[PDB]
């Protein structure tokens, strides 16, 4: 008969199961179209005044001052490190094109 016996136990035997990956855990993965959209917009929109100054320091090989300015503007190191890498590749792509 349908009935739940609450308390006591049911069984101490264990057998670990392998679980798949949930769709929500896929968030943050980069898409082929989102990467294209961002590359187009980044060129179209231009650069912020603080990104222009940071790009100037990287061009003059003053990376110590560039990283300091990015952190002072953005707030943390890993945000500054990511921005410097993004702007460095912009310079490299600009140099290859021009």
């Amino acid at each position: 008969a349908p009935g739940l016996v609450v308390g006591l136990n049911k069984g101490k035997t264990l057998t670990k199961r392998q679980l798949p990956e949930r769709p929500s855990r896929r968030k943050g993965h980069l898409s082929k179209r989102t990467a294209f959209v961002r590359s187009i917009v980044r060129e179209v929109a231009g650069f912020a005044p603080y990104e222009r100054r940071v790009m100037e320091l990287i061009r003059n090989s003053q990376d110590k001052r560039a990283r300091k300015l990015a952190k002072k503007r953005l707030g943390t190191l890993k945000r500054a490190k990511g921005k410097i890498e993004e702007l460095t590749s912009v310079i490299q792509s600009s140099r290859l094109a021009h």
């Binding site: 989102t34 959209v37 917009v41 179209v44 929109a45 650069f47 912020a48 603080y50």
Partner: peptide, 15 residues
């Protein structure tokens, strides 16, 4: 998609 990624660069030249 383009409008919403352009809205993140609020101090860019165009914005």
């Amino acid at each position: 998609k383009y409008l919403e990624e352009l809205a993140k660069k609020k101090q860019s030249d165009v914005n």
